Each structure stands twice: as structure tokens, then as C-alpha cells.
Paper text:
RepB is the rolling-circle replication (RCR) initiator protein encoded by the 5541-bp promiscuous plasmid pMV158, originally isolated from Streptococcus agalactiae and involved in antibiotic resistance spread.
We provide an experimental X-ray structure for the Ba2+-RepB6 complex and describe, using both experimental and theoretical techniques, the OBD conformational landscape in the RepB hexamer, showing that the protein displays large intrinsic flexibility at the OBDs level, allowing for fluctuations among multiple conformational states. Surprisingly, a symmetry mismatch occurs between the OD ring and the N-terminal origin-binding nuclease domain (OBD): the OD ring has C6, whereas the OBD ring has either a C2 or an approximate C3 symmetry depending on the crystal form. In geometrical terms, this displacement can be described by a rotation around an axis at an angle of approximately 45° to the central C6 axis of the OD ring, which places the OBD at various distances from the central C6 axis. This leads to a total of nine distinct OBD orientations relative to the ODs in the two crystal structures solved, three for the C2 form and six for the C3 form. A structural element that may contribute to stabilize the outward position of the OBD is the presence of a metal ion bound in this area. In addition, E137 (OD helix α5) of an adjacent protomer interacts with the metal ion through a bridging water molecule instead of making a salt bridge with R7, as when the OBD is closer to the C6 axis (inward and intermediate positions). Some density was also observed in the protomer where the OBD is in an intermediate position, and was refined as a Ba2+ ion with half occupancy. However, the presence of divalent metal ions in the medium does not seem to be determinant in driving the hexamer towards the C2 conformation, as Mg2+ was also used in the crystallization solution of C3 (even though no divalent cation could be located in this structure).
Author numbering:
A (entry chain C), B (entry chain B), E (entry chain B), F (entry chain C): 3 to 203
C (entry chain A), D (entry chain A): 3 to 42, 53 to 203
């Protein structure tokens, strides 16, 4: 059958032990658990809210079979805990989808939840799953350049500060400016020398 | 088998979900999708136009196997969505080939489509994937040198400014000067120190 | 073909010279040898630390020639050193969960000054995490050079997870980037 | 397994599509194609310039898929580009010495803006020769920066074998070393 | 087969020209030649000492094949000079083993020879071929840091001087500090800038 | 049979065309030809000088058989030109041996000739055959350090100058200092900064 690392599935509060949150920790795999979903618009007649459930993002350590994860949770939480496991094609999406903040979920105007009710098991960090491919770097690098040139930023700090305010405007966060100007260090020096000399005239 | 970043393949409107354009977005990979191909001269007897189809240009983030992308789309859009995935040798061509405006496609006098019906998923920008073959770089580098020497440009800025005006004259745009002087950083420093010392006398 | 520093493999008392423990020493590479495994045929687990990235098969041969072609038939690349080492006494997480026979830490044979504390580096994704931290730090407290940063570390290290030899391991190669940060701070302190 | 930029191979008119000349263009790599060789079976010699170091077999496949598996069966790595190019018209030194039939330079098919003048670099041992020269020069005439050196080159280039784009090709990567030389000269001019 | 830099092999006085010691010099490779081995305990019945022989430690300049060195010596000294060439895994050991002072040789209580009868051809210096395994470097590097920090050494010289006096205390000799701070150049600059700024306050 | 790149052999003025020096050039291989040997002490009774001859150092472009070179010269210069071809084990030696300035030739107190009468065919340069193996570099590097430290040389020039005078004392020539401090650029900077600061106090 098929194998993969990224899975997702549903957990209903009614069908799971009261210590599930700890029982899942025991698997030693990283997971992300949605805030509780208790506000999903039910197209069912005479009912506003779908039964309450949790979405679980589950990250095997090695390529395995969907059914291997099915069993592993049935044994952990009882056979009535889950009945449907799916392979995650894109992790970033399925994760935003936890709070209905993914592109598909906003376009279907679904109820938005709170990022803070998200339960991170086993040091799960979404970023250790979001890579910034080559071409994306150099794009932004040129941006950082247009920026340092435009606003005559004279050092790594002034740039950082500028980012702190207008970050979202150009798509930039601090740890991204750090990831971007990685290794381009020398080039950066050139840009600040430039700006600094220019501010002088 | 083989691994690579650049792929292409075919999508038939009849075999794909009505939300495919969004489903592909979910993969978080950049793609370029042809205008609809509904005008391809069919050498089949009794038929003017090949079945209607879409060409998809697909840019993995990391070298992967053709079959890995086959599966990924079969699961996304249904096993009847594609049956043939190919490795793209030249991105620039296979992209022009989307509107039958590539050299091969003009020489086979194939129906030309409209550039504007091209669907760009995930901030795909063709300019990202065309890059200066080696010899091209060093040519221009020598140019940037003739330039910094000739006009006594004393820093990355003055050079940039000069480029802003006389760019086309020498073939240079800003993001090209950036692509060119990549890694030659050190060498650049030498040139500016030169110019700056020289302006002083 | 793959190259790496960390390997492991099996040695059977029946198939090895009676002076193997010394013969391995001769390779001048650091190794850790399990207590004898006789409670799982009796065998030894060997943790082997090349000095330079090499091929699994290069180590296969090197031991076949050293101890005889019947000494080992399977060499593996070690992904995590800390684990594969605990696994020597079946005290690794995987080995406790499979309730395997636990051995004695003291029967472990350390060849060529092998010290487990040594081969613990930061996996990639860990370095850059901390690097960003060192940045948030140098930015926040306007540290103007490698020293002021060091000092700051000396006091509030544990707060941010940093020790001196970690700051050193972290800012490895990021040298240039660091220069940018101090120039920054120093200019900023001036205004 | 070996990687390189420069390859050559054979194409037989009998085994290739009638649009091959265009099909090769599609690869977006620069090539030089011999006039037809029918005076030595009739064949074409192809000079092929990968954009990045790759494996001979990677190019084998790439052409088998492009032109059909019967198009080529032998791909070779080009050691010297200038020669293998002259060898297209049997005007290379080896080909004149074996008195082989000479063809016409004009029947040569240049795909994708291939220009022979482009792929002539300095072999290793040649660079460092000249580098030492640039050093003897910067030392001798106390040139105090990349400019003064450039200027000097502009006048006495031919004397030492140097042109500007060669000084650029030479001092490639030796950047740092160059800095040392100018600091030197500049300090020395001061005394 | 295999390529490597470090080899060893045997030379019998009976089978070699009387000018061998000079003939080997001619190869322009560094070698170390054992004192004469004429005292090796022979397990052969009726004989105390193995035939007399020399051990040769041979250091190619570039990775080559064992057989390439076999030939090279057969041609130099005659085909009856050597019949067995081996790749040296550890140079430091195989060198001590020249005087039977290696760990293996002491444990097998073999006859110990004199260090002074060792013939060094072509400026062979054992210290050249013993080198700090990775972890060893970085240990000492941190030391050099603790040092430059502790005593506020403001440049490569002051550090050097300090080493000249208190070397042994920290395990450091000059050519070791040089071997250690190899490539860490940049990092070193940071440390001196630090110290120097700090001395100012 | 055996194959190799480096050969040597003898040419007698009496047995060779008067245009030999040009005929050899025609082979397009690099060679080095001794000054004329007309002063070799003949152990023959009643004769001071061996018949006059030339030594030829010959560098095939590809591994070939000694006999292949035998023929190639017999056809070029006539079958009476040479009767003995040998494989060169060490090029540097066999070349010094051209003027009897090799170690073996000095030890046999043989007549020394003039380096300038050496005939270099086809751009033969002995150095393109003399490599400086790793350990040799770093040895000398430490030397350059002991030197820059000792004499407080404050820049690449002062070092160069010092080399010009005391070169041979430490084994150093200019193009060797250049080959040595290759890539160690940064480290060098450290040394000059050091010296320069130190001269100030
Ligand atoms: Ba219940
Ligand atoms: Ba309702
Ligand atoms: Ba990341
Ligand atoms: Ba992304
Ligand atoms: Ba903010
Ligand atoms: Ba349908
Ligand atoms: Ba571009
Ligand atoms: Ba404009
Ligand atoms: Ba050791
Ligand atoms: Ba092009
Ligand atoms: Ba004898
Ligand atoms: Ba040493
Ligand atoms: Ba002392
Ligand atoms: Ba005659
Ligand atoms: Ba006599
Ligand atoms: Ba050389
Ligand atoms: Ba040498
Ligand atoms: Ba002199
Ligand atoms: Cl960096
Ligand atoms: Cl760069
Ligand atoms: Cl570093
Ligand atoms: Cl460069
Ligand atoms: Cl260095
Ligand atoms: Cl350099
Ligand atoms: Mn939901
Ligand atoms: Mn089509
Ligand atoms: Mn076991
Ligand atoms: Mn031909
Ligand atoms: Mn012995
Ligand atoms: Mn002679």
C-alpha cells in the first residue's frame, strides 16, 4: 500500500479517554491538535453545529501505512476513537485548516477558531515543516535590497527595525530576514556601506 | 530512477474536480497552468480538435521522483486526472510551449493561445527559473567592471543608480546586477575601494 | 554513494581473534563497545566514529582485514549517536519500550578515549533556532561585541538555553553575519 | 562517478528525426554541430555544453529521449573544447597530422548561441602562473588598487600577456589575496 | 581497487642494492625507515631470529593504488625487493610499530629497538601526519576563546606570546594554535575586536 | 607491458640529424634536453671523457610503452639515434641529473654543467611537474608565521622583501610564499594586523 510521513484524522470528545491529550504524547511522535471544533455549520436540518470534534495533525518518524496509524490510535484510545485516517499532502495547509484559516477554509467562509487553543504535542513546530525554496530566497533578497536602498537603512539593525513595522507589507518577518540573508553576508555589507556613504552626502 | 525539480503533465477538464485550480494551490508548490487547450489540430480523421486539456508546469521544492509527483496529483485530484508526468529539461521553453509560442511550437505552426489565460499558482514567476548560464555571468561581470571603472561609481548604490538609468544600454536590470555579482562580493569590494581612492586624487 | 562519520555493527566472540579489543584500538578511531550481549547467540555491539566522512563499505573492509572476513557482515550508519549508545545497554527509549534485557553500563569498553559527551552536536534546525535567539539577544540588549555577548551569556545563559561552548558551536561559520550584528549594535549605541 | 560540462557524441542521419536540428535547440544548451561527415557511414559530430557539471549518462539519456534510443550509443567527455571543435572540420592538430578529410567551417551548425570564444578558460597551472605575475607587477610598480592595476594593464598588457578580462578571470576568488597586495603597496607608498 | 596516501612494506638487506637508502630518497616522497629488524622472535623451530628486514613507512603525495607503489619500488630496487605492500590505516601507530613501541607491539612483548636508528627520508616528520580529530579541534578552540577572553589578548600576537609561556598549561603549542584556528579565521577576528574594544573601557 | 608518462634516454651528436632539435619539437610533446655532456669522467683506460652525448627528458601526454617511444624516436631521428629508453621514476631528480646537480650526482662528484645550456622543447616547465603536498604547505605556513612574528613584518610586501633576501635560509622563494599562503588569506590578515599593532607599542 502507500506510505507517507504526514497524516490527519478526527477525535471526538465523546469517544476518547479523559487523558487522551497525554496518551497521544506517549506515542513520541509530534502532533498538532486543533482547538476544539464545536462551531462547524451543520447543513443538517434542525441543527446549527456539527457534533464536537478535534482535528489531529500527526507526523510519523518514518514512512508508514495509513492503517498502521489507524491501529496505533485504536489501541491507544479505543476502537471508537477514530474511523478515518487521511494522508496529508500539504502540511502547512492542513495546519492552517486547524483553525479554518487555510485558503480553502476562508473561501468556504467557515468558522474561524483561536490559534492559542492549539495543542502542540511532542515539540511539534510547524516551521520545522515549512521550507523556503531557492528561488523564493533570492526574490526576497532583491526585496531586502530594494528596501535597504529605498529607505537608506544603514545597518542590520535599522533594517531589522524597519522590518518590525512594515514586515507584513513586504512579506518579511525577522527570522525570515535571517534565513534570507544567510550567507549573502558579504553582499549585505556592500549594501550597508552603500547606504551609509549615501546618507553622508 | 531519477530526481529533478522541474515537471510537466496534462490535466483534462472531464477528469478533474471543479475546484482543481484551488486544490493544486494547496500543494504549496509553484505551478504555471496553460490557457485551456481546446484548439489543437487533431490528425485523427473526422476531427478538428484534440480533446480539451490543460498543460501544467510544476516546480517541486526539492529534487524528487517523477512518480512521487504522479501519486501526489492522483491523490489530490483522483486517479483519472493524469497518467503521464514528464521531467522538464528546459523551463523557459516548456513555459512558452504553454501558449504554443516556443520555438518548436512555432516551427510546427501550432495554434497560438493567449498569454493572459495562463494561471499562475503559488506566486510562480517564470523569471525565477531562468538563470544566467555561467559564461553569461562573467561576461556581464566584466561589464559591471568596465562600468564601475569608467564612471567611477564608488559603491553598490551609485552603481545601482547608474543601472536605473542606463540599464538597457548594457543589458542590465537591478535583479540582474544582483544575480551577477553573486558571490563575487569580494571582488566588488576591490572595485569600489579602487574607484573611491581614485576619485580622491 | 553515501558518506558519514557515525557507524555501528556486530562482533561475535566466536568469529574474532582473542585480541580483538586491542586490534580495534589500533585503528586509532574512537569506539564504544557494548557489554557482552548474551541475554537477548552471544554478540558485541560496536559504536564507531570515523574521523572523516567515509563509506559504510570502507569500514566493512577495514574491519574484515583487521579481524578476519568472518567478523562482521553488516555495517549500519548511525543517525543518532546518543540513542545508538544507550542502545548498547538496551537503555535507549526504543529498547525500554520493547522491554529488552538491560545490561551494565560498566562493562562498556571505551576504545581510543571515546567520550559520548563529545559527539552531541546541534542538528541543523536547532542551530538556526538559537542563532535567531542570539540575534534577538544582541539586538535586544545592544551587545556590541563577541565579549559583551559572552558576558551576557555567563549570567542569563540558562534563560535562553545558551552556554558559552554552544554560542561558539552556534555562531560557527555565521561569523560574517555576527559582524553585521555587532556593527549594528555599536552604531545604534552611538545615537 | 564523473561529472563535467563539456561533452561530444555522434548523430547518424539515418537514426534521427528529420527535425533533430530543432529538437536539440529545445534543450536550451549551447552546442556546435559539425558539417555533415560523409567523406571519412555518414554522421554528425556534436559538441555539447551542459550548464552544470553532470554525468555522461545523464546526457546519454537526455538525447535518447529527445531523438530516440537509436540516435546515439556513445557519449564522451571533452577534455579540450578548442580542439574537439576544430576536430569538427578535421582542422585540429591531431586531424591534420592524420591527414583526414577537411570540411567547410560554414556548414557548422551553432545551436543556442554557442560561441567557441566563450569556453576558453585558463587551465589551473596557467592561472597561478599569471597570478604570480600580477603579484610581481603590483609589487614592482606599487599599484595601490584594482584600478591602478587595471590602468597599468591597459598600457603594458601585451608585455605580460594580460588583458583586462583575463586579470578578472585570474584574480577570481583570489580576492582576499589581492586585498593583501594593495594594502601592501599602499602602506609602502606612504614611506 | 582502492586509493590512499599512507603505505608500509618490507625491505630485506639481502634483496636490495647497497645504495637503497639513496635510491628511495630519489622518489621525492617522505618515508620513515625502521632501525634494522634483526631481533624478531621467530616461532620457527631451531631459530631465534627472523631473517633481518627493514620496515618502511611511505607517504605518497596523492591518493594512489597499492600496486602503483609496488611497481615503483620493484623498478627502483629490483623485483626481489618487496612482495607485500599494505595500506596504513593509522600512521602514528605504524610508526611507533617501527621500534615495536606501538600499543599492539608492547602488548605482544616484542623486541624494542632504538628510536635513533630510524632513517628519515625526504624531511619526513611524524608530527606532520598526526592531526587533531574534529572534536579535538573545537575543544581547544573553545579554550583559545576562554583564553582570549580571560586575559584580554588583543591580537594574534599577544595570544601567541601568551602561548609561548603558558602553553603546556592548556595543552597548546604554537603550531597547534595554528592548526586549531585554521579556517576559524573570521571567528578569531571577532574575538580580537572584542578584547580590543573591552580593553579600551 | 608497463605504461608511464615520464621517460629519459640518450642522444649522440654523431648519430643524429643536424636538425634534431627541431625534429623533436615536431613530436608536440614537452621535453628537456641536457646541456651537451662532453665532460663525463671515463673509467676507460687512456681516456678522460666519455663520448659526447645528450640526455633527454621526455613527457608523453598519455601512459604509453617504453618501446612506443623507442620506435617514435628511431623513425624520427634514424635507428642509430637511441638504443636505450628508461622510465623516469622521479622527474625532479632526472632533471637535476641533466646538469649533474641531482643528489646522487653530487654524491658521485660528477662534472657539473650549466643550467642555461638546457634546451626546453615544447614549453616544458619543470614546475608543472613539482607538487607541494599538503603537509609541506602547513609546515612552511608555520614558518611564514614564525617569520612574520619574529621580524615584525607588517604587510605582504615587507614579507616579500624579507623573502627576497633570506629566502634560501628558510626554503622560501616568492612564488612559493604565494602557493603557500593560498587560501590562508584571512589568517595572513590576522598576522599583519598583529605585527602592525605590535610595532606601534
Ligand atoms: Ba466514553
Ligand atoms: Ba441548520
Ligand atoms: Ba524553516
Ligand atoms: Ba513556502
Ligand atoms: Ba509589530
Ligand atoms: Ba466530471
Ligand atoms: Ba532572473
Ligand atoms: Ba527607469
Ligand atoms: Ba589520539
Ligand atoms: Ba539563453
Ligand atoms: Ba645482495
Ligand atoms: Ba601536528
Ligand atoms: Ba618556552
Ligand atoms: Ba651521421
Ligand atoms: Ba682515465
Ligand atoms: Ba607547481
Ligand atoms: Ba616536493
Ligand atoms: Ba636575491
Ligand atoms: Cl551567515
Ligand atoms: Cl553573495
Ligand atoms: Cl567559524
Ligand atoms: Cl571572485
Ligand atoms: Cl585559515
Ligand atoms: Cl588566495
Ligand atoms: Mn472541521
Ligand atoms: Mn498541446
Ligand atoms: Mn542486541
Ligand atoms: Mn569523424
Ligand atoms: Mn617486525
Ligand atoms: Mn651522463
Amino acid at each position: 500500500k502507500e506510505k507517507a510521513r504526514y497524516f490527519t484524522f478526527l477525535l471526538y470528545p465523546e469517544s476518547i479517554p479523559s487523558d487522551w491529550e497525554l496518551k497521544l504524547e506517549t506515542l513520541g511522535v509530534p502532533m498538532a491538535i486543533s482547538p476544539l471544533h464545536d462551531k462547524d455549520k451543520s447543513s443538517i436540518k434542525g441543527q446549527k453545529y456539527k457534533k464536537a470534534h478535534y482535528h489531529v495533525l500527526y507526523i510519523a518518524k518514518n514512512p508508514v501505512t495509513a492503517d498502521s496509524v489507524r491501529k496505533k490510535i485504536k489501541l491507544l484510545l479505543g476502537e471508537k476513537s477514530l474511523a478515518m485516517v487521511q494522508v496529508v499532502l500539504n502540511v502547512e495547509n492542513m495546519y492552517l485548516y486547524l483553525t479554518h484559516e487555510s485558503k480553502d477554509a476562508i473561501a468556504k467562509k467557515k468558522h474561524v477558531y483561536d490559534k492559542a487553543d492549539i495543542k502542540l504535542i511532542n515539540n511539534f513546530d510547524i516551521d520545522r515543516y515549512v521550507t523556503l525554496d531557492v528561488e523564493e530566497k533570492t526574490e526576497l533578497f532583491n526585496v531586502v535590497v530594494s528596501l535597504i536602498r529605498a529607505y537608506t537603512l544603514q545597518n542590520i539593525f535599522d533594517l531589522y527595525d524597519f522590518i518590525d513595522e512594515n514586515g507584513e507589507t513586504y512579506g518579511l518577518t525577522i527570522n525570515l530576514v535571517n534565513e534570507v540573508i544567510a550567507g549573502k553576508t558579504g553582499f549585505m555589507k556592500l549594501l550597508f556601506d552603500g547606504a551609509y556613504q549615501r546618507s553622508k552626502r
